[PDB]
């Protein structure tokens, strides 16, 4: 008895194999005395004629063949349970023990595949059963989505922005390495937008071949309804261009809205592409990849504004300035009133410089504030950390709230004595 | 030597004594040997003519009398500081010692109070030095502002509210004990809304004599600019059912809106009443009451939707229920899509219940939480303390930023064998 090693497998498979001839395997490795085996049913037998003869067409034919690949094909319709061993799959190798000698058809056991994610169906393979290693001729597409880091033109897996700042995001879809073994290619990118968020309505679909991309747009009719971006050519064969080792990258824009979360879990998107997940025959099986995940973060500053005894202190206005390329800009101002709580909503990792630009009566000008916002967002895209710090002044931070708070203590003018 | 104390008084007055007559107090209460003292000019000498004639066309004249209130008034114009006597005013009862015989005038000095508030300058008295107890001829008006207290149906210094319900608000002016003195009453209430409330443009004006109340509305026009109402009569006078023993009332309603401050020093409004500080003749100077402020607290919940791993899960959604009349009622929905984390803004203290109305695929339906928030709201009107409870889960809460935190642990469901 012989064992086949099945490389290039996954967890998830029950991957079945079919006695389809017997035969002796002789000191000369040629298969003799062939017999239809129990896994051929008897009308296949009577379709297909004598096995003897069948292998004979076969013999010396090369491993690819058109004849070896119209045989797996056809088989499939004749195959009996009768002569069926069935294996679970490791991950990277699957050992396949026990196999009296002759010629098995390999595939996955049918409809195993289906609603589980991220997995594909074998092309059907025809194999002698020696103590042999042969890669399962099996591959599934990758989807990896990222955003465009804050002003360092690089993707990543989360970032921090300002709420109305448009944010360049990517998504990019590999093949699978069989994608010429498909005739029809269902291909399906649904990208949900969170209610943080507000798409531009300008997504692009560019083919990617090597370092040069190019503009497919024109086969890809993108629709927009409940915060859900579908990208579908209905089959992605219309796009003849596409090899094997193309890239699909879709690239839109979105901005944080005044619905926007602080910091905690912050404001992911999630795509998923469905695909064609079975290279044998005239099917139209899909499966869905795993989810792929990007996220932008918002950091909220709230302003206390009070006098020595903890009380609030009305009629106080404050301005905040950003700083972009060494230039202090205005980001938000509140005039004043009756108000003592300046909540600036939608700050991103960044210099800052709060300025009081109303002074309550009586009371003495605030020194201004330079300050310095710090989201730590690791490789996972998790806000873990979050600081803020001043030479001139001291804050509190919460990062599953996003909130930065600084209270403002103010001091009376001098009531002086006249001699 | 006498001594004069002169009671009703508060800090921050500067009470000045002029001797307007010399003379000799005998055994009985009558003056005599009568002559102009320092306190007076030579042109009011020349004016008022002999002194002891002058002193004998008082005699016998009512205490509250036209002719003594028409002296003090045209004394005012030939006072001289060769005859003054100054004091600072105690809290309660203002000691006036080293007085020689005779007459005295007694005033606030000249533009004393025109920078504080809350005070308001006396009639000119005219006093005989005795060894007696006098009450300054001085009061001002009080502003008091409340808000209606939640379901309480009484008013407080502060409560907590939801946005988009209207909330009572009550402004009650008393008046001074010498309102009759005024020949014209400037009277002018300004109450500034925060941004995060709303006014209902409804202020109506009552007045109260004791425990009934009358629409005297139509002789207050009120203008609402730059969140400030303005309630003025241009004189109270004109309004001739107004007593000295009447309470003037302001009532309006405002709602909380999408712009609330959460928690920390809440949403508060401030009113002071602008008032005629000044009895004596012509006038038309003003003193502002010192600010009253009411508030109003609202609370946000964040619920965070996780797996196991403490990873954020999408596709949930909730819905909020708020016990109103032992019947709970929806307040607020989300959708499901790919966000995680639902901020329920502008909740109030009470009885709630939050149902996973949407469960992420794959889950298990959270059980529904019945929980309750209790804002701690003192005398004063500071919010202190800010607690979630419940049965069947844990909150986080902080008071400074009214947030109320709800990790939402999803446990995957069953993927069962099949024989
Ligand atoms: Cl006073
Ligand atoms: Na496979
Ligand atoms: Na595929
Ligand atoms: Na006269
Ligand atoms: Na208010
Ligand atoms: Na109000
Ligand atoms: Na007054």
Redesign the interface.
Known sequence: TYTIQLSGTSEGHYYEVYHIFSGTLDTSNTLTNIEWAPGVTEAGRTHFGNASDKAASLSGKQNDSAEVKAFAQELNQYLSSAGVTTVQSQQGTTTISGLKPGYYLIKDSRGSLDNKKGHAYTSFMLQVAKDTTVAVKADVPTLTKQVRANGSQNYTAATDYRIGQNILFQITATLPSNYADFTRYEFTIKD?????MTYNNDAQVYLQEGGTEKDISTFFPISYT???ITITPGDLKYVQDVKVSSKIVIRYTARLNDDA?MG??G????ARLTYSNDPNGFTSTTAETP?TKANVYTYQL?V?K?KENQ??L?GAGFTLYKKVNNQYTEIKK?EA?????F?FKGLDSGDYKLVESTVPSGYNAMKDIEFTISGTIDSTGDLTNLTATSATASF?T?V??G?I?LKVVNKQGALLPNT
Chains 1, 2 share one sequence.
């Open positions: 949900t937008i969170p209610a943080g409940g915060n859900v979360v905690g879990l404001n992911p998107n999630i989810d709230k206390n009070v009380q609030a009305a509140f009133d009756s108000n003592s709580t909540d509190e919460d599953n709230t909130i708070t």
